[PDB]
Amino acid sequence: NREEKILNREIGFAIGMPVCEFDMVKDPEVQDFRRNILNVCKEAVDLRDLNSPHSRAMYVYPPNVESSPELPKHIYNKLDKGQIIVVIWVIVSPNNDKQKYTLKINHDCVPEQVIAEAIRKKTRSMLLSSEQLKLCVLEYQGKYILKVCGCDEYFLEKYPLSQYKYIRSCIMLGRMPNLMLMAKESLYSQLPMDCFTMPSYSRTSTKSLWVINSALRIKILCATYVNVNIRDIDKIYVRTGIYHGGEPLCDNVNTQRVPCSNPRWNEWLNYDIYIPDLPRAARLCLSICSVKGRKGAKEEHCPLAWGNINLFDYTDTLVSGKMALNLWPVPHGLEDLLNPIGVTGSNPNKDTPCLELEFDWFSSVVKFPDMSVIEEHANWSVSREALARDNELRENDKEQLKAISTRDPLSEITEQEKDFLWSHRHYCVTIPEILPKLLLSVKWNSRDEVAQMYCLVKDWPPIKPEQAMELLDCNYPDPMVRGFAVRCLEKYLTDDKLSQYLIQLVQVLKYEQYLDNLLVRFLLKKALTNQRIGHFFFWHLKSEMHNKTVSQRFGLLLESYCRACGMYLKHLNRQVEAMEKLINLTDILKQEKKDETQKVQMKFLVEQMRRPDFMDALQGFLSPLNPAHQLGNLRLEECRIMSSAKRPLWLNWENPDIMSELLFQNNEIIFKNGDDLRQDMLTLQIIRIMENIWQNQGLDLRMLPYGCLSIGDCVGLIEVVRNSHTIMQIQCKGFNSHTLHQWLKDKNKGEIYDAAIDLFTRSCAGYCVATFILGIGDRHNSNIMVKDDGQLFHIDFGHFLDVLTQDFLIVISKGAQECTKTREFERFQEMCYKAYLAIRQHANLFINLFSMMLGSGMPELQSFDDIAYIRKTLALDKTEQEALEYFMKQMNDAH
Ligand SMILES: CCN1CCN(c2ccc(Nc3cc(Nc4cccc5c4N(C(C)=O)CC5)ccn3)cc2)CC1
C-alpha cells in the first residue's frame, strides 16, 4: 500500500532508525510485540473518538492542572476572601482588536462559570434585563473555551480554575491571569481526524515446570569472535551465575580454563538448584574472562564480554535446545566478573563475541505453572508442620514491623529480620507499606516460599505510587510484584505526578525481562491519551536511542507510539529536524572551529544559519522544552555563542501567538552540546519536588526548577530565566559586600523593599537546604543568580553528590553589620530547620529516585556511595532531634 510506505519513513525519520530494519529481525518476541502492542494503540485511539470532537481536543490540549484542587492555607490567604482577579480577553474580528475584561470570581469556579461572568460584563450596559441575561449567557457558555494568553494551553475541563497550574502559579507569584475567549469551533476546526490504520505486519505436548524434577545444567559449547592478544593472555574461561534480580540463587559455576587460541569447552555445567525451584524471573548471567599469569602477583581475571539470558521466554516456556548469545562490551566501572544488572538478550551487533549454549530438552515444551497450580501448591504445605500463638504479635513486635517499613531502598534487612518478616507475613497485610521489605525476605529459589508470597500479593492492599515505584526498580524482577506496582500506578498516579516521575519510569523499562509487559503498556496508553505526556515520553526515549543496550527496545516502543500518536508525528519530525541541524552545527564548532575567535565562529554561525535548508528547519516548530510554546521566526540578530565551557548557543525566536505581549514576546532557549543534561534534569526534578513538599506544609520557599530537556547524547536544551542576573554581573556594577543589598534596594524601592528581602530570604533558605542535601558542587559567583525582585536560584547542576557568603546575610539582615546576630537571621535559621525536617520525612522518595537512575550512566551517579551521601546529609542513621542537631552544626559551620 502507498499510504503505509510514506508513514514508515516518517516514523523512521522520527526514530532515527528505518522501520524496515525492524521487519528484518526474526526473533518471534520482537514480531509478537510489534503485533500485540497495537491493542494499546486501538484502545487509545478509541478513547480519542468517544466524545469527539471534545475528547480529541482533550488529547491534544489536556488540562495542565495540579494533583489536587485543595489549596494550602497560606496560598488561599493570598486570595481576597477566596477570590481571584482575572483579566479575560476577547478578540473582535473587525481589526482583530483586543478588548479586555477584568473579572473577580471565586478561585473554585469551573471555566464555564468564568465564561458566564465575562459575557455578563461584556454586555453590562447593553440594556439587558434578567430575561435577557439568560438568552445570551446560557448559549455562549457552551460555545466558548478559555485559553492562556501567549501559549497553546487551554481550560477544556470542569476543574476548579485555581487547580490549573497557570492559575496556581499566578496566585503564588502575585501575577494576574490573562485568559482569552476562543470559539469552540475555532479550536475544533484545527484538529485533524487522525485515521489510525492497523499496519500490514498484523494479519505438541506441554509439561509443568514443577513435574520436571532434576537439577539444572547448562552446556557451554564454544565462543567465536574472541579477539585477544595471544602474546600476553594465558587462558580463557566462562564465568556463570543464576540470578534473580541481581541476587544469586546459587553459587557461580565456571567452565574449565582453555588456551585463549581454542575457545571451546563442550562442557555441561551443573548448578546447585532444582528446576522446579526456578523462579519466573530467573536469569542466566555469564561472561567470558581472561587469565594472565604474573610472577609474585596473583592471576588477574579480567572480564572480556558479558551477557544475560532469561531462563523462561516471553511465553513462560523453559528454554530448551541450542542458542547463540552475542555478548556486550564491559562497562567501565564493573569491577566484578558478571553483570547481573545489564540488559538481557543477544547484542544486535552480531559481529561481536558470540557464545553458543545448550539447554536440556525434557521430551516436550516445559512451562511455568499458572496461578491455578500455584494456589493449590500454596494452600497445600502451607501448614505441613503445625506454637501458633507465639507468632501472634505483641505491641513491641508490631511496631518493629513498622520501623522496618520506614527504611529506605538502601537499608539492609538482617537475616534475623528477614525471618521475622516472613513468619509474620500474614499480619503484614495490615501494614501494606511493608511489602517492599517483605518481598526481600523470600528465598526466591524455593517454589513453596514463593507460591505463598504470590498468594499474599494477589489480594494485597494497594500502596501509594511513591512506594509502588520502588517495586519497579531492578531489584524486584518478579512479574507479580511489578504487576501489583503498575496496578497501583493506574489507580492512584495522577497525570501531574506521572509527568514529574516520567524520567524514572522510562528508565526502568530497560530492566524489564521482556518487551511486552504491564509497565510499557501502561506508559504507552497514557502517552497516547495525553499528548503532553506523549511528547516527553517520546524525548526520554529518543534521547537514549544511541545506547545500543536499549536502542532496540526503545526503537520498537517509539515505532508503536509514532504509529498511533496522530498528526503530532509531523510536529515531532519538525522538532527532530531542527535539533539535528543544531547538533550538526555545534559539532563543527566543537571539532573544526574549536580554537578560533568568537568573531570567526559567529561569522560561520550567521552564514550557516542563513542557508535555505537551515532557516526552514528552525522556524515554525514547537519548543521541545514546552510544546505549548510555538517557536516562529528565528531573530538571528539576538542569537550568539555564549562564553560558557561547551560554547552553548543562545537562540531567540519570536512568539507568533496573538497575545504574546502578555506572556513573553521572544522565546529564548540555550542549546548545549557536550554535557549530560539528564544529570541536570534529575536535580531540577528533585528541586521541584522539594518545593511542593514545602508548599503543602506551609513553607513558601520559592524555588526555580527551570526547564531542561535532554534530546540526545550529551545534547539538550535549557530554558532561559528572564529578568535574572548572576552575582558576577551585580557585583561588577558597584568588590564591596553591600553591592548585592544596594542593587536590590534600587530595584525594590518603597513598599516593595521588605518583599524583596523576604523573597530573597525564603528563596535563599530553600536553596541552602537543597544544595546541602544534594551535595551540589562548584558553587561560585556565576552559579548563583538573583532576579530583579530578589528571587535567588542556582543554575549549574552538572556536579552533585560529591554555601552562605557574607553579602547574602547582609541582604537578609537588611544591611546590618552583625548579620550573625540579627533577628532577621533567626527567621532564616528556623526556615532552614523546618525545611530540612520536611525533606527528611521523604528520604525514601529522594533515595528511590536516585536508585532507579543508578544504572543510567550519569557520570556523577556511578555507585551506592554517591547515593549514600544523601543518606548522610539527611541523617537517616539518627533521631529527629539528633538529625536537626546535625543540620544545626553545618549551619553554624556555614558563615
Ligand atoms: C547496598 C545494597 N543493598 C541496598 C539496596 N539494594 C538496591 C539494589 C538496586 C537498586 N536499584 C538499581 C540499581 C542499579 N544498578 C546497580 C545495582 C547494584 C549494584 C550497583 C549498581 N550500579 C550501577 C552503576 O548500575 C552501581 C553498583 C540500577 C538501577 N536500579 C536499589 C537498591 C541492594 C541491597
Numbering used by the authors: 107 to 309, 322 to 504, 517 to 864, 872 to 939, 955 to 1047
What did the publication describing this PDB structure actually write?
Class IA PI3Ks signal downstream of tyrosine kinases, G protein-coupled receptors and small GTPases to regulate cell metabolism, growth, proliferation and migration. They consist of a p110α, β or δ catalytic subunit and a p85 regulatory subunit (further referred to as PI3Kα, PI3Kβ and PI3Kδ), with a broad tissue distribution (p110α, p110β) or enriched in leukocytes (p110δ). PI3Kα phosphorylates PIP2 in the plasma membrane to PtdIns(3,4,5)P3 (or PIP3), which can be converted by 5-phosphatases to PtdIns(3,4)P2. Here we report on the discovery of UCL-TRO-1938 (further referred to as 1938), a small molecule activator of the PI3Kα isoform, a critical effector of growth factor signalling.
We next used a deletion variant of p110α (p110α AA105-1048)30 in which the p85 adaptor-binding domain (AA1-104) and a C-terminal membrane binding motif in the kinase domain (AA1049-1068) were deleted. Co-crystallisation with 1938 did not yield crystals, however, soaking preformed crystals with 1938 revealed density for 1938. The bound 1938 is in a pocket surrounded by residues E365, I459, L540, D603, C604, N605, Y641 of p110α and, in agreement with HDX-MS protection, S1003, L1006, G1007 and F1016. The acetylated indoline of 1938 sits in a pocket comprised of L1006, F1016 and I459, and makes face-to-edge interactions with F1016. Two orientations for the indoline group of 1938 fit the density equally well (yellow and magenta sticks in Extended Data Fig. 2f), and both orientations have an internal H-bond between the oxygen of the acetylated indoline and the NH group connecting the indoline to the pyridine. However, in one orientation (magenta carbons) the compound is less strained, with a better internal H-bond geometry, so this is our preferred model.Binding of 1938 induces F1016 to move away from the pocket in order to accommodate the ligand. The piperazine is surrounded by E365 and L540, and points out towards solvent. 1938 induced global conformational shifts in the p110α crystal structure, with the C2 and helical domains moving away from the kinase domain, the AA1002-1016 kinase/activator interface moving away from the helical domain and the α-helix AA1016-1026 moving toward the active site. Activation loop residues K942 and R949 are important for recognizing PIP232, suggesting that a component of the mechanism of action of 1938 is to cause repositioning of the activation loop to facilitate productive phosphotransfer to PIP2. In addition, 1938 binding causes pivoting of the helical domain to bring the ATP-binding loop and the N-lobe of the kinase domain towards the ATP-binding pocket.
